[PDB]
Structure 1
């Protein structure tokens, strides 16, 4: 028993982190085979951040402008190119610790682990979710750019995120590993801000199933609603619409607990309308939306 925000073991990713320096800018890189991936703004200076032309800035650079450090061993840069908002630095040595990997792009509502790094050295690991406005609620300080987000499935690391910057509200923005931003954000200095956000409904129901599996049942009731009558109330509380596909994904949790998806929706409908009355669910006094149905099944007992 127990239910916690659990990150994947970060071992496989720690062996890939390096420090990339260009001039006075130092940030983190990801070393896979003979390529180091890092945010392209490592070539920029404080003056070059109003409206930079990265193609112009990259062509005025040479291989010797990039210092790459893998722990203590220096890596010799033999090539450089840009791929969208990411730099690809060809190095002379293939990383002997390169795990089996994929570059995948995630959707709002999906979760991933983040290995926060500073100067090529990992400081901590935690779990994150991609919000509907394409921001994440992470924990990052100056020098954390280049830190990556990932999921693991049978020793295969699926890299999904690279950290680039912090938005004015304190939320975080980054790209997939192909250099394409999550959301309408740019790697230049603008007054950009995160758009409106909604609560991930399928995740809140999955977390209510984890609570039932762990003994929290005070919020249950005999009632049941229709998918359409549930969506009318969800809309008023700024919750994402629940679809029939989400009901089918919640199926295994519904089967394990003997509580129907529309039965669970009637309890969520009441929690939104009345609140919790000073009671808690899995040690929390708010409804949690950062656990997917997969995360719940992965952590909870199958009994």
Structure 2
């Protein structure tokens, strides 16, 4: 079969802690002797409308922060601001720290989210970095500080820390350097994102995954040039496909025997005609949150 699959979250669960400053509590990520968390933990409800973060942070001391790993309190021995995050130095190192890296994910790429509440892991799901730099996640009150990550041979690449839910229900956050993805700001305001687009490379990978798993009703005897495909794709708010993206689909094309441009012609027909009550891999819409890597990993190992 074919399902949306997240990385096993164990390596990340062992890093989640709770951070409290006054009456504000959120999640933190404890790696070696540092705890990372969103900086708005230092704000009161009144500060959040227009916070002068450097001004608010200089008024805090080490004992202002209560850090808890389960029932155990970790003593904060230093603090510094890391863009929209705080870096809290603690007096003990996390023995459960995996091999890790901090990466800045690009639009179209996917990652797993470990949703946490009060320092306790609660759920794990897969998300994609949207072209408009939001993520379509599922986060409730207390989820700030939850992280997004990928795993490669026991190394955890952390790429996202959660901060905000927009009025439309989509989400905004930062990388682990504290830099927001997109034009968002950590202030208590209603913020709109730019117009989103469909991740074309991922839709094509998902159509290849459908062929690999028996679904091929949408295929046709036609072909298209890359430019003619891109003209139709842009008309429907889909990202243009570059020659680099065609090359990425090489392995999936060689596996199914379907040329990349032949799959583009099938997608062009789907965009123009529609699905007309039919389904692809159980879905009634074109799915764009599976990368070619996600498809290859799930079908081949």
Report TM bin, short chain. Answer: over 0.9
Distance 1:288 1:26 in 2: 36
**Structure 1 residues 242-272: Cα deviation after superposition (integer angstroms, max 9, x where no partner):** 1111000000000000000000000000001
Q: Normalised by the size of structure 2, how large is the TM-score?
A: 0.99
* Matched position secondary structure for 2:247: helix
Which range moved further: 185-194 or 232-241?
185-194
Q: CA–CA distance in 2 between the matches of 1:180 and 1:271? A: 38
Q: Deviations over 1:206-241 (max 9, x none)?
A: 000000000001111111100011011111111000
**Distance (Å, rounded) in 1 between the aligned partners of 2:190 and 2:167:** 8
The runs of 4+ residues in structure 1 deviating greater than 6 Å are none
Once the two structures are overlaid, the 10-residue window that deviates more, 97-106 or 277-286, is 277-286
State the shift of 1:137 in Å: 0.5
**Is 2:201 the partner of 1:217?**
no
Give the Cα–Cα distance (whole angstroms) in 2 for the partners of residues 262 and 226 of structure 1: 7
Structure 1 gap ranges (5+): none
Cα distance in 1 for partners of 2:188, 2:144 equals: 15
Q: What secondary structure, in the 3-state scheme, does the structure 2 residue paired with 1:253 have?
A: helix
Aligned-pair CA distance for 1:278: 1.3
Paired residue secondary structure (1:300) = helix
Matches within 5 A, 1:271-286: 271-286=270-285
Q: Output the CA distance in 2 between the equivalents of 1:6 and 1:191.
A: 32
Aligned Cα root-mean-square deviation (Å): 0.7
The offset of 1:38, in angstroms, is 0.1
Partner of 1:188: 187
Shift of 1:142: 0.5
C-alpha deviation, 1:52, in angstroms: 1.2
Offset at residue 135 of structure 1 (A): 0.4
Give the drift of 1:190: 2.7
Structure 2, unpaired ranges of 5+: none
Q: Aligned residues, how many?
A: 301
Q: CA deviation at 1:301?
A: 3.1
